[PDB]
Design brief:
Number of strands: 39
Number of domains: 2
Distance between the termini: 25 Å
Catalytic activity: Hydrolysis of Pro-|-Xaa >> Ala-|-Xaa in oligopeptides
Largest sheet: 8 strands, mixed
Number of helices: 10
Organism: Sus scrofa
Strand content: 25-35%
CATH architecture of the largest domain: 3-Layer(aba) Sandwich
Keywords: Acetylation, Cytoplasm, Hydrolase, Protease, Serine protease
Shape: globular
Subcellular location: Cytoplasm
Structural class: alpha+beta
Bound molecules: the ligand *[C@](O)(CO)[C@@H]1CCCN1C(=O)[C@@H]1CCC=C1C(=O)NCc1ccccc1
Function: Cleaves peptide bonds on the C-terminal side of prolyl residues within peptides that are up to approximately 30 amino acids long.
Strand order of the largest sheet: 32-33-35-34-36-37-38-39
Radius of gyration: 26 Å
């Protein structure tokens, strides 16, 4: 099968670093420089063998045509009201970017408000963040180029959709919050740095500042409102209270769901916003999360995890702020995670729970916390919502494995609340009733029961004959909940596949204890959980190792890369997207310093000892048994991935090809594809998304010799 040879790649054998007495060799350290001729030649040589491999089999074309056909369905966000007008996002089917529409009433004719498609030939300029002024008359929006986290904020007057002159540069990981006087907007920016700031650089991002931009002025005139020069990793994001009276500052350091919470009573500023604000340090530590829900005068309602791993709602009165005085408005549930909370129609709260990895949605009274209404939902996820304090109605969007889903509307001025289907779209080509989703709970190595969703054609024999696609993430308190994926359903219908999603530790599915169960010293739980998921699928007859594919992205790319090293015998195929591979150096680049709350940091002797054991880059090793080789592997990355700098995948594939790819017994390919004008994944145009899934499933089809089923 291997009709190509791996490129020559220089090994710098002098690259030796001491980590607490452990010598680590890093012969591909030079691939850390994205700008060198050496690195560019490496990328070109790798793509030169990967692309013809992927495109040799007719199956890529059949997949791509079927993806193009089935992905072509209308896609809407929830309606949301701002001031006098309604807005929603909409893609007719195959537009590169969804388009923002405005209408003057729910029954009124809609018109294009902001169309990102006209900003590039190839749809690689994408909306990233936006905020309307309190009165709905002005609009700020972030644009990112080529998938980079870097943002340029531009502005529009809503009436007439008029471009304004204001442009804000050096924006990254930014809040956008307008003061209610409509004078201007808070946002974050980074100090100048040497070299590039376009998504191709690896430079660390430190000293993020909070600024205020007065509409109608140059950026050079913006007011510095908060900075933390003694704490270069702190990130202070601003929002206005619902009554416009307070600026709330949430300071983060790292990725843990915790924040300091400072406030500024704007009425108490000596002369409006003119410099560093008179911050009152209400919560001045990182012991808990405090997510603002609403306030009534000085009584502030927050979603918190303080003393409550599954989250709860508390009231903190700013005039009596000590923790012993806080009121518990909605107590923590013993098992279900309070995922998010919104305040709507003055005195309702909308609460969204995660119950065994499925969403529920409930209306509660603001004053007492009492449950008033359950909004009935099928099993799946709530993935969109609108309705803020002043609004008198809600929209919410539901999705699941087997249907694109439904947008509901509920008029909250009615005595008897009755949600109605507002929009529903059918995907002709996939009959949902041919398939089923089951949820099982399998024991991991230590006996912990892990949830797994399995999706497959009805009536299949569990004889181990089926190809399977097993997906995981396992980190950063992120819950992996049901979602509609055309690309995965084509695998099921046209490749005869079984789909599986394992809810491994590290995620947020069972609250903070689930998260803590897959971080730091215990990160190996994630890999154990995921290996156990594969073993369960095999034992129960859904699949066999030779027909099993695993996939994950980012922290999920680490997951699958590590599982390949640790259990090469368990998997036939591995696709690792935009993965963190160098666990010893991840913290040196761009925003990687923020992930040490999940992983630890190699500067620490204790953390190094955890990290060295599973770092994919440092654990490539020929399997001992003559009958065992590495699975076929595909790494996907891109040249403007400034979230997880591509050096991770570059160094990892060089190592795989040298240590494993050169052995006689290795016949499974070990490949990387590096895309151009693309980044970590957010804002990826439709055309690239289609090419990407076509690459992935063609890879699977070719490595496992799977026949297309028309
Ligand atoms: C991927 O897993 C997912 O994109 C990468 C690699 C490890 C974690 N990760 C992230 O993107 C983390 C997960 C959740 C948010 C992340 C992040 O780095 N966000 C940027 C950011 C913004 C504000 C404060 C801290 C970090």
């Amino acid at each position: 099968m291997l009709s190509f040879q791996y490129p020559d790649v220089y090994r710098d054998e002098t690259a030796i670093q001491d980590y607490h007495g452990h010598k680590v060799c890093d012969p591909y350290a030079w691939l850390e420089d994205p700008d060198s001729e050496q690195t560019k030649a490496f990328v070109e040589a790798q793509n030169k063998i990967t692309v013809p491999f992927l495109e040799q089999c007719p199956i890529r074309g059949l997949y791509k045509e079927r993806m193009t056909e089935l992905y072509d369905y209308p896609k809407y966000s929830c309606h949301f009201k701002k001031g006098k007008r309604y807005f929603y996002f909409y893609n007719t089917g195959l537009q590169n970017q969804r388009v923002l529409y405005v209408q003057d009433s729910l029954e009124g004719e809609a018109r294009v408000f902001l169309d990102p498609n006209i900003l590039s030939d190839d749809g690689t300029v994408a909306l990233r963040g936006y905020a309307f002024s309190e009165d709905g008359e002005y609009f700020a929006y972030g644009l990112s180029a080529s998938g980079s986290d870097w943002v340029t904020i531009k502005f529009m007057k809503v009436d007439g959709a008029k471009e304004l002159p204001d442009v804000l540069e050096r924006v990254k990981f930014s809040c956008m919050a307008w003061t209610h006087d409509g004078k201007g907007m808070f946002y974050n920016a980074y100090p100048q740095q040497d070299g590039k700031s376009d998504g191709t650089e690896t430079s660390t991002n430190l000293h993020q500042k909070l600024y205020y931009h007065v509409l109608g002025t140059d950026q050079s005139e913006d007011i510095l409102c908060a900075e933390f020069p003694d704490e270069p990793k702190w990130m202070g994001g601003a929002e206005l209270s619902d009554d416009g009276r307070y600026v709330l500052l949430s300071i983060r350091e790292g990725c843990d769901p915790v924040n300091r919470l400072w406030y500024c009573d704007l009425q108490q500023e000596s002369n409006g916003i003119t410099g560093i604000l008179k911050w009152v340090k209400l919560i001045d530590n990182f012991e808990g999360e405090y997510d603002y829900v609403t306030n009534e005068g000085t009584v502030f309602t927050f979603k918190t995890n303080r003393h409550s791993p599954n989250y709860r709602l508390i009231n903190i009165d700013f005039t009596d702020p000590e923790e012993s005085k806080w009121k518990v408005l909605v107590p923590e549930h013993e098992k279900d995670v309070l995922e998010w909370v919104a305040c709507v129609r003055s005195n309702f709260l909308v609460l969204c729970y995660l119950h065994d990895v499925k969403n529920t949605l409930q209306l509660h009274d603001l004053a007492t916390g009492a449950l008033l209404k359950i909004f009935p939902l099928e099993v799946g996820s709530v993935v969109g919502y609108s309705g803020q304090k002043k609004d008198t109605e809600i929209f919410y969007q539901f999705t699941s494995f087997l249907s694109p889903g439904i947008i509901y509307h509920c008029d909250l001025t009615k005595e008897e609340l009755e949600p109605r289907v507002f929009r529903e779209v059918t995907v002709k080509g996939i009959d949902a009733s041919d398939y089923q989703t089951v949820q099982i709970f399998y024991p991991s190595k230590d006996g912990t029961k892990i949830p797994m969703f399995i999706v497959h054609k009805k009536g299949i024999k569990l004889d181990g004959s089926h190809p399977a696609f097993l997906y995981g993430y396992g980190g950063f308190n992120i819950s992996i909940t049901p979602n509609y994926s055309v690309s995965r359903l084509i695998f099921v219908r046209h490749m005869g596949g079984v789909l599986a999603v394992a809810n491994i530790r590290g995620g947020g599915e069972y609250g903070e204890t689930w998260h803590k169960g897959g971080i730091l010293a215990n990160k190996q739980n994630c890999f154990d959980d995921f290996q156990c998921a594969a073993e369960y699928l095999i034992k129960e007859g859904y699949t066999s190792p030779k027909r099993l594919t695993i996939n994950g992205g980012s922290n999920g790319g680490l997951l699958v890369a590590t599982c390949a090293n640790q259990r090469p015998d368990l998997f036939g195929c591995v696709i690792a997207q935009v993965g963190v591979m160098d666990m010893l150096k991840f913290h040196k680049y761009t925003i990687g310093h923020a992930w040490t709350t999940d992983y630890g940091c190699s500067d620490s002797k204790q953390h190094f000892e955890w990290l060295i054991k599973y770092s994919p880059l440092h654990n490539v090793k020929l399997p001992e048994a003559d009958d065992i080789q590495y699975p076929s592997m595909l790494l996907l990355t891109a040249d403007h991935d400034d979230r997880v700098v591509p050096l991770h995948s570059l160094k990892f594939i060089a190592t795989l090809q040298y240590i494993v790819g050169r052995s006689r017994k290795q016949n499974n390919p070990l490949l990387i594809h590096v895309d151009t004008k693309a980044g970590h994944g957010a804002g990826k145009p439709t055309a690239k998304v289609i090419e990407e899934v076509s690459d992935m499933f063609a890879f699977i089809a070719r490595c496992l010799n799977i026949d297309w089923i028309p």
